[model samples]
Target chain A: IVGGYTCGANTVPYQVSLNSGYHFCGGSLINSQWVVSAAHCYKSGIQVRLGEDNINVVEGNEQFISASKSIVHPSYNSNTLNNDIMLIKLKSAASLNSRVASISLPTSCASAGTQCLISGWGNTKSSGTSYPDVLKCLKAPILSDSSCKSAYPGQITSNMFCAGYLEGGKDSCQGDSGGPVVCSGKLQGIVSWGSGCAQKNKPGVYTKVCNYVSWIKQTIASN
Target chain B: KPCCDQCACTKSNPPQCRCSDMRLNSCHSACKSCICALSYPAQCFCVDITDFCYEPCK
Candidate 1:
């Protein structure tokens, strides 16, 4: 929440802004008709906006659509925040192009130390009241499960992984939940939660997309 | 906002990469130098760039 700057328009083509009257969380366009985000991001009156870089102003390329269904992972734990992923079925299919497209799902698990990119419109700092109008993107490296576990102690589980620096000052914050973690040109993680925004020794936790690849495929197919 | 047509620029960082390439550089500094792989899905080793300048991929 504290370190990213503005992202260029169309840089992250699949990025989505979840609006519940106001901007709430971030999401990714997995396909023309399906969106992937964190289960915790769901709030009442949630709608998906795609192809837009600035949330405050509407651009012609932006596509506003409603979700016909919001499916949270069956195993999602509100207490532990595990299995934090969710899928939103669009009421209608999105028009894909250079400005709007689906991101490729991970073919394999992201290895430790892999540098991944995250983008959202969440607050720049944990204490900040103002959220950025333009989307902000940060580059975070994937931490090993052991390293992640040590920082978080018993809180971390197999369903979750960690990224960002132990030294602090760079991470996804409160409003950034449900954002995509793109690693190696694939969707690898989702911004689930963290101890605090960019605290020392507390890396940002994320839902490992690789763990639920089969479930995602099955869910999409069945739904 | 200036970046390679094919590269995605970090709003604050350096070493803009093609949309398909993942940046291996840390955000500790403005990435200046890089060691990019010569392949399809390019991999660049960036640390901190000077003046937000990016060299052509080798």
Candidate 2:
């Protein structure tokens, strides 16, 4: 949530906070009982809360569910962050409302220059230790694959893409991992990893959602 | 004439006129181009000037 403005209440119903004693990562509700997050963020005793805007207070619109099971991608490599995606099965299904809903998955890959929105409750400043109590949202443009490759040579693979400004401002940071990168009301990416928060010419890297649709579909049906 | 080399003049209500190649630093004060009116329906304005801070306009 670095370099982002406070998001309006209930603006993104799909956004969820992955809390393990405390809020450490963000997630997206893909359906009644399934959530999409970063594999690297998964941990034991994780609980998810939907429709929450401010982490400081327990609002009436919020719905909490325990993580019954977690599934990380089989090929996920911690070192390279390749295939860094995961799914969480909720103990019970979430009841949808104005403040709680699911985001649609993308059918095609996001193109370059596509304006997308990223939301979370991560750190506000790059070097700051404090995380924001309220959810934050920022608009970032999807960079071309070539441009993304240039930024991190020999690191970015087909499974990962980039988004942010060439100028040193506006991007996702720590604690924002496992959050949603949405475009046109659809889930396009998951905040996987990045070098730093809003560094010059450095965009936030994300797990490309389109590549995993088949795997996700298979996982949900089998599980 | 002073701020732009050419301007768009049409046959509409208030006849919207756009100032072309308007410099960002002096557009507001240097010329009475379309930037005078705040709203779009009221008047036209110079847009997309590079290397100029848009803080004042907001």
Candidate 3:
């Protein structure tokens, strides 16, 4: 069910594993050689499935190389979840095609209130289960950075971003970690943490990619 | 051979120690009649009457 679509909005993201099994989420390809995502998503031997919908069955046609090296922003703190950004150094550069390609990182991202798109295979509702292998996408307007800080109160920092309907009919949940939060057709942020998965008054928080350009560049350069 | 507390058997220049302890027990070499006990890693060594050889066991 997931692979039938070619739209970026229907792209299925995934995480590879060495033990139990591999699973899927929603992710975006940023650089020819990198896939930006949440720091917590960092793990060895991960496989990302892009441009697909069915997460369990329908295998995406293209498989991007997992980076041998993944660097989480040094400023990242699990407690605060600040600077949650991380970069994956793919084994080789991926050729960009309209159907299977990467998005540009934001040169000048907005504060929030910016209309964006969040796609994932996370739980559709709190009590509900994760979606099928097929990917699903929904439009979300960015919430103000300051408003997010006020909502989160304690650990909200510049590295954090919030999105989704405050009333929360839909949002990314547990398995949605390490996916992208795109805005204006560019790589703007990554899904990291939130109070509850798609809960009312609690939107998904993301790792601001704009803040970690230098760190991401230097990390990619070293490879 | 298994030696008892009474008759001490001296094998050669370097004595050969033998024991059969299924329970909580031990085999001590007689240095003319003495006690050898220390448990660093729980072990005991039996030497010849001349102190030339020490066979260790636990």
Candidate 4:
């Protein structure tokens, strides 16, 4: 995350990193057996690494679980980056603890201007592959409808929303896909995409999670 | 893969961003130009993360 700070140990308990031989995307632990992430982050043989702070170490609380299956949103459009959410069913349940727990999914849409926290092991800047070993947190506000739609013409949809500053500063960068965008302590959005990172008028766009509540719950129940 | 386009900054006070779809959104590299500046109303650049060159991606 650009213009962000490192997370304290266990500060983001629900945070998880996607590994396809190496860390690539970030996710949120929504339940003992399910992880919420971006559909774009999916790959065969991808594993879920939970309770992670530093990706390079054997952090005591970390749990490495294989994914039994990954389900991408049915309406996902890769070309447009719409409906970009994904769900990974863990091969084994994560042992819940203070250091490893699930976060609440949204029941309602996040109103514009609500302050939110976006955390990830993504690049600290918009212009590099400098992914931090430690988690970084960016505090940003949800953009107004006018600004969000204005940033990307014919791109912003009901399933997507922009977050961060229009003047260009902090934002989600590379290697941060599928990361958690928490607002009011709820998993409100997922780090989906953006234009060259934090460029002026180019705020980070996220998969609005509130729009997928039924799809999430029903899939879990059916599984 | 995502789409990238030949995007450039407009002289308008508040620029409008468009993913021109000129190429794929596969730049896993450093920003070659766009929004990498410290100056007000930053600049634009691109990375060749895709097969095509000079393409800017997300």
Candidate 5:
């Protein structure tokens, strides 16, 4: 059965069918034709299943979209997990339905204190057991660059953004990688990596979508 | 400029060795270990090898 879609949670927002042994964490529909996700998912088989949650939205009504190709950032580093973002060119455009919603990219960086949302089947606590079935959502108050930098010292980078409480608890924890961090009604960031899932003084870090706007535009344009 | 992946060391050090692997334990002259769980003076590193995990980086 189709459900009203929300970002971040439901692992595969778009219809993502992986090749035989491939795997995917999460993805967002950029247009009627493309989806964006982490490169690891693309590398697994270069194929994706879209519009379904946790293995095709429903038991048997899932849609499959073979990836025409993928564009991963040249600077991506798996060991360090840098530049983890990638764009997927769908073999064919998807037909919009109740379960799929197109995610918009942020045209500019959101100001500090802007509250955003993230949802997923990730662990409730940084190191705690993961939630089952129904997806859970968490809210993050955007920390100012200066504040985030001070909280994390040199840990934060320009290419990444920070969310969650600096002291600890309340963050995008395990199994939430490659998930979206929606802020200001735009797809502002993607779950990247951190020292721990929800350790104090460390919040979840994400690929700053605004910083990669040009790169994303260029990549999507060619498709 | 060296590439981002380039943790440049030296010309003579083609296969440059890094101190990245922490010292599990040590002796006066020199003794080191790679595993983070080794005995005293030999340090081991901790990597996340968990299932259903997520790590946020920039």
Candidate 6:
């Protein structure tokens, strides 16, 4: 979470952290039984804890649950980082409250220049060291595909979008690989990958959520 | 405007210096457009003239 503001308790209710064996990746609770994370973050024994603002220390009202099963996108290409998304089904549904709740999936795509919120527990330092105890949230603008591809040529695809200040500092891909990228209160992106956190001419790339809406809905319905 | 002409030059707009050295020794005291990365070690990237380290004013 480079150049991020420390998030308040319950400020992002849908935010969840993966692996109780200690935070592996940040995830978003989409419903009582499902959480969205990056496909690369998937592990067999993964765990999720709802209402998580901090992971180094315990806070009240955290609903820790084990993953019943995890599904990675069929087209998820690790080589090209294509469709880098994942859906994890919880063993049991999480109870909703002020601290634990699901966020809405995008009904439509987010536009460029729209200010979106990204929340996660990641290294505050841009150097991949010193991950913070509390969750940090950054509001970064969606970058136009023209500049996104311009920054990362042969890399940006339809399933990916870019965000953050391309100038130098502030990045959505701070540390949490599977973090949430929310626009207008809807899940729009997942921290897929980036050209290193907050580099000049480089923006944080994410798994475009709009492209996978039907896939997510159908998967949830069938499973 | 003491530090004005002391910042790196590239390709030389009017030809002051060829940006030979961006070394902090040139930036620490007298440079108009020198800004560090703001991260640890805080390396200063100075330009007696501007073009490369330009953050695009963003």
Error of 1 at A210 (Å): 0.3
lDDT of 3 by residue, A24-55 (tens): 33345766777776665556676655545454
Whole-model lDDT per candidate: 0.76, 0.78, 0.54, 0.79, 0.57, 0.75
Q: A1-223 in candidate 4: lDDT tens per residue?
A: 8889988878999999889888878889999999998887767898899888888998798999999999998988765667988899999999999989999989899899999999988777666557688989989999987898888876788888989999998888777888889999899999887777788889888888999999999999998
Q: What is the lDDT of residue A19 in candidate 2?
A: 87
Reference-based lDDT, residue A95, model 2: 99
DockQ of every predicted complex: 0.02, 0.01, 0.01, 0.05, 0.05, 0.03
Compared with the true structure, what per-residue lDDT tens digits does model 5 show for residues A6-62?
333334353233333333355667787877665544453555555555442355545
Once fitted onto the true fold, the runs of candidate 3 whose alpha carbons sit more than 4 angstroms away are: A1-20, A24-26, A58-60, B1-58
Candidate 1, residues A18-89, lDDT tens digits: the string is 887787788999999999998867655678999988888877889999998998999887656778889999
Q: Model 6 scores what on Cα lDDT? A: 0.75
B1-58: candidate 1 lDDT, tens digit per residue = 1132122211111111222123543221434445577776666644332222333343
CA lDDT of B29 in candidate 4? 51
Candidate that beats the other on lDDT, 2 or 6, i.e. the better one: 2
TM-score of each: 0.78, 0.78, 0.68, 0.82, 0.69, 0.78
Model 1 lDDT, residue A138, Cα:
95
The fnat scores of all predictions, in order, read: 0.00, 0.00, 0.00, 0.00, 0.00, 0.00
lDDT tens digits, residue span A1-223, model 2: 7788889889989999998778878889999999999887868899999989888797789998999999999998765678989999999999998899999998998899999999988777765555788889999889999999887776789999999887867888777888999998889999876655687777788999999999999999999
User: Chain A structural similarity (TM-score) per candidate?
Assistant: 0.97, 0.98, 0.83, 0.98, 0.81, 0.97
DockQ of 1: 0.02
Worst 10 residues of 4 chain A by lDDT: A122-131
Check candidate 4 and list the clashing pairs. Answer: B2-B25, B33-B44, B33-B45, B34-B44, B34-B45
- Top candidate by TM-score: 4
**What DockQ does candidate 6 score?**
0.03
